[PDB]
Amino acid sequence: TFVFCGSAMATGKFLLAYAPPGANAPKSRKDAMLGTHIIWDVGLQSSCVLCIPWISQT
Amino acid sequence: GLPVMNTPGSNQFLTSDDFQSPSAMPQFDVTPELNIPGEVQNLMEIAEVDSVVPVNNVEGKLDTMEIYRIPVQSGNHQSSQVFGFQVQPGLDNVFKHTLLGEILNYYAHWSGSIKLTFVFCGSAMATGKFLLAYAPPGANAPKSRKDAMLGTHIIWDVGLQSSCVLCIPWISQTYTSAGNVTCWYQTGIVVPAGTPTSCSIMCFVSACNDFSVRLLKDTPFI
Amino acid sequence: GLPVMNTPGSNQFLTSDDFQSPSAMPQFDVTPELNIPGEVQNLMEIAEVDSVVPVNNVEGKLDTMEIYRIPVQSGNHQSSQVFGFQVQPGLDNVFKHTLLGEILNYYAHWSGSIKLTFVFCGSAMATGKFLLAYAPPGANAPKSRKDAMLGTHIIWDVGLQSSCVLCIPWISQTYTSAGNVTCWYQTGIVVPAGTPTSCSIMCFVSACNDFSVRLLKDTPFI
Amino acid sequence: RVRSITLGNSTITTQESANVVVAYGRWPEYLKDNEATAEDQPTQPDVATCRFYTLESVTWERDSPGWWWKFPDALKDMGLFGQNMYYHYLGRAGYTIHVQCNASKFHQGCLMVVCVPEAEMGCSQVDGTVNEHSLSEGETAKKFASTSTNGTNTVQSIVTNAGMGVGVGNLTIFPHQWINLRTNNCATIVMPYINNVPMDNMFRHHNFTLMIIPFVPLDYSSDSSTYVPITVTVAPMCAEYNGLR
Amino acid sequence: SESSIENFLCRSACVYMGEYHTTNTDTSKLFASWTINARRMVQMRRKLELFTYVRFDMEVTFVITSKQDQGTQLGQDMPPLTHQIMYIPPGGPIPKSVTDYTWQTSTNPSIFWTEGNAPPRMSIPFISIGNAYSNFYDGWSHGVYGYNTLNHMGQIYVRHVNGSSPLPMTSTVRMYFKPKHVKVWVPRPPRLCQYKNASTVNFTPTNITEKRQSINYIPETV
């Protein structure tokens, strides 16, 4: 869960992106847009939620 | 056989006649139709769509985006005019090149009702009041805020509503003999510390369902 | 009597009109029809017949029976190309003068599916394998035996089958933008002692039942 | 009052109070079965074409004329949907486009967001022809200008004529949405596949064009941020290609 | 009712006027030709650009007038003149002289007409392997920007039908064109700038509208 702790007058947009195991991390905003992502407007929502499905260890 | 008699009008070419004609490619089966989205049956479906009015059509800015923005200034000017125009689609420069104006200019007679929408594009901290006034055809435009209050008007608080709507009922065509609309500062705009001072209003025009047109002609623009 | 009015188009001769005409020999009873075998109702009955393709249309042999024979050579060449062409009936030289090509050249638009048959004309002692590969329109022709294997292909063993069949589904007309077909040596040809060394392949083309044509025009050959 | 949406291995977050424009009333769908029964069999990927792709954000400053993108080929480097553009000879698809802003209550401005089919553009030289690079740069946006342009082979990109020779106040005839920083900051447009043939090749034809155009410029005061970011996210819908077997 | 699509588009217009002789020393002045499209008639072009896709049939009527050349020779006694009007579908042979073989191809429909009668007329169906015509194309021909080959509609050619060594004469043809059974898809905004050539959408930047005196100005009421 992500929560924005700014004043109630601030607005803007973030891009939250997820890469699966075995994939490289995106290097730009555009190739992060070309994968799995959500666009988060903090003038509308103060918090965002993500659920990640394939977790194991070594 | 079959005695027959030719009438006047025989063997003439009338440019608007309606007759069956022989096909030059009878043995050709045509491609069947596709169901393409967005089909049109009537031009009044184009005129019932809103489009932005260039209300600020004064010198020096006929080729910029500024032509579309009504300026709201800062400070205390609580009885001055903001804007005013005559409602004359088809003829008047401010309405002439909109989607509604471009259609009406294909016909020599038209009539119906019109819809005007106003939208306030300022910051969410600004508050104030405007007075929107309508004068019918044959009446002079009001000269003050008080006589505009003495006619048909609405008081629009932009701290409560961001948009206002008007429907005008007696529109026809041919020092105008048309109705007019004007806007006045009732209070002035008030802001907190750290917000922009000036701001803008935008106008949208459209037609209402009862609009009719007659006598297709040629348009005067190309 | 009977008031009547002549319309435009009266007393003209339209080359494609369809009117009843007066007979010049009314008192003449015609010979009745005979039931001759082999009657035709439609030109697509001619295009659905196989005909031999001149795949070997290179220099020095455009006037011999050799134009129809694809050469299969002897020895070990088990990754080399045997032949390849683009599938373009009507326009391309190898398909242009067949029974299907000659019909299609009477019409300005056509579309359907096509059938290609390959037949091995060697001795009954010869064995080996070929790889037959199809690339769709908009794709490049394969350059090796391995990337032809990575697409749509069939492996054809001539010691088991003497003939192979292909049906191609998306054919239309207008550095081609058409599909292609290629053939590769998978193994090489193997014979016992006392049999001829070289041999030949033949191609037949035809149309499948769903073939359509439009806009009769004039052919460019006479 | 926040919804969380997952397509594939992607997740984004929107507000449940969103408003959605379905372009002409038509949702996207597959060409059903039997336009071309016999030797025209299609296939559909449905693997990682149905997933959110997020481009780079653009920066809205005080003097920004606008931005435009071409579809497709704004996605020709986007993972699998871009691979399928090279492997297959014909295709088709609809799209869902989300546009979002990040701004405060002390900012102000107004944007039009419009999706225009067949947006054929004019050259800066009247007896000239447009170049392929000047029409698009893929996932990077082209820019409108505030005055009339020059140079060879360039789109004439003065923003009042939108590069098409019309009045820019009349683009509301197309599927569009308004973003007024005062009342909302988001826009969703669902576009179906619109062509005069059922399938087509995806490299030499631009089906539609997404444009974003400020009608009231960004304004701020003393020590607010001097820019506002805009973010675009695209999900392809009901994609379909020619069969390969 | 007058704003329906049929009443707005289905109207006749003169789209081409051409001259041709019976004898000349240029041999291109011996026949007249026209390629069918709706982009060199500026008033029809603009009404057609309000939509993205169109589908219609065509009807063509021909008005033909002749004259003896003022060269020298008088006292003639001539029978009325005959003319041939040939339509070529898309994918047909094009003549290059008036003596060419293509004036006799069985798949080019043709009309034979002699002066004094009613004006000739032919009817062409929707001819396209696509499902609609397009007024706008954001693509490449395969390379020309904005030009797609599905919009081909054919050509018209006109000559005299004399024998050998004819007498000198000059004719003029006017073609009147009319679309019928029309359907349109995806409305667009109206063209605001003047057209510059017949194949592109090129334009010089234009003002949004004309000016007035101030943003408050309303003219004095009568």
XYZ file of all heavy atoms in Angstrom, chain B residues 34 46 79 88 137 165 175 182 196:
71
model
N -20.527 -3.299 -44.599
C -19.952 -3.514 -43.286
C -20.661 -2.644 -42.259
O -21.156 -1.561 -42.572
C -18.468 -3.182 -43.313
C -17.624 -3.679 -42.156
C -17.553 -5.171 -42.225
C -16.250 -3.063 -42.245
N -25.312 16.639 -36.342
C -24.069 17.381 -36.204
C -24.285 18.693 -35.459
O -23.406 19.134 -34.716
C -23.452 17.596 -37.593
C -23.003 16.258 -38.158
C -22.291 18.552 -37.547
C -22.753 16.270 -39.616
N -19.391 46.154 -10.345
C -20.563 46.382 -11.179
C -20.241 46.481 -12.655
O -21.084 46.962 -13.408
C -21.338 47.626 -10.734
O -22.019 47.376 -9.520
N -27.191 35.488 -32.734
C -27.504 35.482 -34.158
C -26.618 34.449 -34.830
O -25.599 34.783 -35.445
C -27.311 36.873 -34.759
C -27.642 36.988 -36.219
C -29.023 36.508 -36.545
O -29.221 35.720 -37.466
N -29.996 36.987 -35.799
N -35.575 39.810 -28.408
C -35.436 40.606 -29.633
C -36.380 41.796 -29.626
O -37.550 41.679 -29.272
C -35.786 39.613 -30.741
C -36.575 38.565 -30.076
C -36.023 38.443 -28.705
N -26.195 26.994 -17.529
C -26.843 26.623 -18.782
C -28.015 27.559 -19.057
O -28.738 27.956 -18.144
C -27.301 25.150 -18.732
C -28.257 24.835 -19.843
C -26.122 24.230 -18.805
N -29.557 47.326 -34.772
C -29.603 47.189 -36.208
C -29.541 45.718 -36.504
O -29.026 45.295 -37.531
C -28.465 47.957 -36.873
C -28.780 49.424 -37.073
C -28.657 50.330 -36.027
C -29.209 49.900 -38.298
C -28.945 51.665 -36.201
C -29.497 51.239 -38.483
C -29.367 52.115 -37.430
O -29.657 53.449 -37.602
N -25.761 39.352 -21.666
C -24.669 40.089 -21.034
C -24.331 39.504 -19.672
O -25.134 38.822 -19.040
C -24.956 41.595 -20.885
O -26.228 41.795 -20.275
C -24.928 42.288 -22.197
N -3.343 31.886 -8.178
C -3.320 32.846 -9.285
C -4.439 33.869 -9.181
O -5.514 33.598 -8.651
C -3.491 31.965 -10.524
C -3.209 30.635 -10.110
C -3.365 30.499 -8.655
